[PDB]
Scaffold this active site. Structure first.
Site, PDB file in Angstrom:
ATOM      1  N   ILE A  52      39.798 -48.776   3.366  1.00 46.56           N
ATOM      2  CA  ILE A  52      39.138 -47.856   2.803  1.00 46.56           C
ATOM      3  C   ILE A  52      37.898 -48.149   2.550  1.00 46.56           C
ATOM      4  O   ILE A  52      37.591 -48.923   2.332  1.00 46.56           O
ATOM      5  CB  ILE A  52      39.863 -47.375   1.768  1.00 46.56           C
ATOM      6  N   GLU A  86      41.167 -37.932  10.862  1.00 45.51           N
ATOM      7  CA  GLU A  86      42.735 -38.017   9.332  1.00 45.51           C
ATOM      8  C   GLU A  86      42.521 -37.341   8.776  1.00 45.51           C
ATOM      9  O   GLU A  86      41.655 -36.745   8.974  1.00 45.51           O
ATOM     10  CB  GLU A  86      42.181 -39.543   9.263  1.00 45.51           C
ATOM     11  N   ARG A 121      42.768 -44.039  12.469  1.00 43.99           N
ATOM     12  CA  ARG A 121      44.028 -44.591  12.302  1.00 43.99           C
ATOM     13  C   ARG A 121      45.350 -44.313  12.329  1.00 43.99           C
ATOM     14  O   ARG A 121      45.121 -43.233  13.251  1.00 43.99           O
ATOM     15  CB  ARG A 121      44.206 -44.613  10.349  1.00 43.99           C
ATOM     16  N   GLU A 133      37.549 -41.509  -6.130  1.00 41.19           N
ATOM     17  CA  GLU A 133      37.875 -42.459  -5.754  1.00 41.19           C
ATOM     18  C   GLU A 133      37.285 -43.830  -7.053  1.00 41.19           C
ATOM     19  O   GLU A 133      37.494 -45.062  -6.121  1.00 41.19           O
ATOM     20  CB  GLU A 133      37.137 -42.423  -4.523  1.00 41.19           C
ATOM     21  N   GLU A 144      28.175 -55.632   7.484  1.00 38.05           N
ATOM     22  CA  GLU A 144      26.622 -55.092   7.949  1.00 38.05           C
ATOM     23  C   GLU A 144      26.371 -54.118   8.374  1.00 38.05           C
ATOM     24  O   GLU A 144      26.690 -53.844   9.579  1.00 38.05           O
ATOM     25  CB  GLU A 144      26.229 -56.097   9.339  1.00 38.05           C
TER      26      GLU A 144
HETATM   27  O1  UDP Z   1      28.120 -48.836   8.089  1.00 35.97           O
HETATM   28  C1  UDP Z   1      28.083 -48.666   7.361  1.00 35.97           C
HETATM   29  C2  UDP Z   1      29.742 -48.060   6.862  1.00 35.97           C
HETATM   30  C3  UDP Z   1      29.796 -46.699   5.631  1.00 35.97           C
HETATM   31  N1  UDP Z   1      28.452 -46.369   5.851  1.00 35.97           N
HETATM   32  C4  UDP Z   1      28.591 -45.637   4.209  1.00 35.97           C
HETATM   33  O2  UDP Z   1      29.866 -45.937   3.120  1.00 35.97           O
HETATM   34  C5  UDP Z   1      30.703 -45.239   2.883  1.00 35.97           C
HETATM   35  C6  UDP Z   1      31.900 -45.402   3.401  1.00 35.97           C
HETATM   36  O3  UDP Z   1      32.405 -45.421   4.755  1.00 35.97           O
HETATM   37  P1  UDP Z   1      32.962 -44.607   5.680  1.00 35.97           P
HETATM   38  O4  UDP Z   1      33.545 -43.135   4.795  1.00 35.97           O
HETATM   39  O5  UDP Z   1      33.120 -44.442   7.495  1.00 35.97           O
HETATM   40  O6  UDP Z   1      34.758 -45.379   5.423  1.00 35.97           O
HETATM   41  P2  UDP Z   1      36.030 -45.264   6.353  1.00 35.97           P
HETATM   42  O7  UDP Z   1      37.409 -44.529   5.336  1.00 35.97           O
HETATM   43  O8  UDP Z   1      35.877 -43.949   7.119  1.00 35.97           O
HETATM   44  O9  UDP Z   1      36.473 -46.307   6.715  1.00 35.97           O
HETATM   45  C7  UDP Z   1      30.286 -43.591   3.315  1.00 35.97           C
HETATM   46  O10 UDP Z   1      29.373 -42.171   2.879  1.00 35.97           O
HETATM   47  C8  UDP Z   1      29.860 -44.370   4.891  1.00 35.97           C
HETATM   48  O11 UDP Z   1      28.566 -43.388   5.472  1.00 35.97           O
HETATM   49  C9  UDP Z   1      27.471 -46.876   6.224  1.00 35.97           C
HETATM   50  O12 UDP Z   1      27.069 -46.410   5.100  1.00 35.97           O
HETATM   51  N2  UDP Z   1      26.993 -48.292   6.821  1.00 35.97           N
END
Ligand code: UDP
Ligand code: UDP
Lengths: 234, 234
Positions: free
Chosen positions: B12, B35, B102, B171, B214
């Site tokens: 997540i 998803e 996913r 969350e 990163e």
């Molecule tokens: O390299 C990254 C990856 C994630 N995010 C931020 O972290 C939050 C959670 O990531 P995401 O929604 O993509 O997670 P997922 O559930 O899709 O894996 C989002 O607001 C993204 O923009 C970010 O700033 N840089």
């Protein structure tokens, strides 16, 4: 499909199981899919049956917690049992008929609908269910679309009396007032043809309505003659 | 199918949504299935989304009552969303790739499994789910079988931080200890390849593991280069 699929519909204890096992034997071209939930009831291992047994009893104990799970599984079980027979039976038969005990339509429009009307399913469960049902059948039902329906029509009194006779413990508390809701449901659906469903061809499906108020166990030739005559019109 | 289907897997908040929308844009041959449950989350009235919103919030309020229903519907929604794109997209494309955010495998082997281990699903619900899953995919998954998986790998700290940044109210209570179970699950499934599933071809499916510890929002070219190199081997 070149196999004719007829469902046999009707109230709890109306005589479906009895009539369906009568039919089986009258022809090599005639074949039956018993209702999966029927299997589950009685007191040999099987996972579906272990699941079915469990959820069925949880249903009797707490319908408002298990209606959605029961009805989802009862349905899947039906679809796969009917597919299994559609694909593995009546291959050498010249006039092949498959008799389904009940259908995915009575699953939704009689039993699930009832449960929602009793508030054993809330609006989300009910909406999720019809959607899943819609989708499940949009994909898989295609070889399951019914050529005809036989309606075994009995008054709720009759039905109640027969629940008695069947003497299946869990069933003995079912009140007349419950069998009358179902009866009104069946009447609406197969007699007045008012119950508008999400499956369009249903509105044109031939129905045979058979009175099974009078015991037919040893005297069923006229019911069979009406079936045969019916079949030859499909 | 002549379309290549790649799922993007990961914890997540690891970055999937972000990476998936990055990819979308880089090619006309590249297409995404977001998803379904992602959709449901926000607000600001499609029937799936009314259902999905309702069950998702009931999930937060009482997982031991809604895990089965949520996970049944989350999965059906995925299957149909992926079918929709498999059949309606990338027809004129010469190198067509479909990226699934996913998959039905993480639905079962990460999320559903977790819920069962949390005792949010009892043995009957868990057994009924896997069977329904087995059967749903035995029939419908055939054009959905993945050609490859991309694993976006982030420590749970990273993920937690990102759940923070995403600022989605519901969350904000997710503890590090939860993200570490999932992470152990993902690690076991896509890194050590020990998680033995009921889909045999999964043991041979190519996996690309990508460190997304990163930030990559403005600096992703090497991630895309690895993706492209990966894709050319499938
Ligand atoms: O390299 C990254 C990856 C994630 N995010 C931020 O972290 C939050 C959670 O990531 P995401 O929604 O993509 O997670 P997922 O559930 O899709 O894996 C989002 O607001 C993204 O923009 C970010 O700033 N840089
Ligand atoms: O002509 C008949 C048909 C039904 N039954 C009895 O009614 C009960 C339940 O019938 P069935 O299992 O066929 O009902 P259904 O399957 O429709 O629920 C059993 O005792 C049957 O023997 C009967 O006495 N005469």
């Amino acid at each position: 499909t070149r196999i004719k699929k007829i469902s046999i519909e009707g109230n709890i204890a109306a005589g479906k199981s009895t009539f369906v096992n009568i039919l089986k034997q009258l022809s090599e071209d005639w074949e039956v899919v018993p209702e999966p939930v029927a299997r589950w009831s009685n007191v040999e291992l099987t996972m579906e049956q272990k699941n079915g047994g469990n959820v069925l009893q949880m249903m009797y104990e707490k319908p408002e917690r298990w209606s959605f799970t029961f009805q989802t599984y009862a349905c899947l079980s039906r679809i796969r049992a009917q597919l299994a027979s559609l694909n593995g039976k009546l291959k050498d038969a010249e006039k092949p008929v498959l008799f389904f005990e009940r259908s995915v339509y009575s699953d939704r429009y009689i039993f699930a609908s009832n449960l929602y009307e009793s508030e054993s399913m809330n609006e989300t469960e009910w909406t999720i269910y019809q959607d899943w049902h819609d989708w499940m059948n949009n994909q898989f039902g295609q070889s399951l679309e019914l050529d005809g329906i036989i309606y075994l029509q009995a008054t709720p009194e009759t039905c109640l009396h027969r629940i008695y006779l069947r003497g299946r413990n869990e069933e003995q508390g079912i009140p007349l007032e419950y069998l009358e809701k179902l009866h009104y449901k069946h009447e609406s659906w197969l007699l007045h043809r008012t119950l508008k469903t999400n499956f369009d061809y249903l509105q044109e499906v031939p129905i045979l309505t058979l009175d099974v108020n009078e015991d037919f166990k040893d005297k069923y030739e006229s019911l069979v003659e009406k079936v045969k005559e019916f079949l030859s019109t499909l």
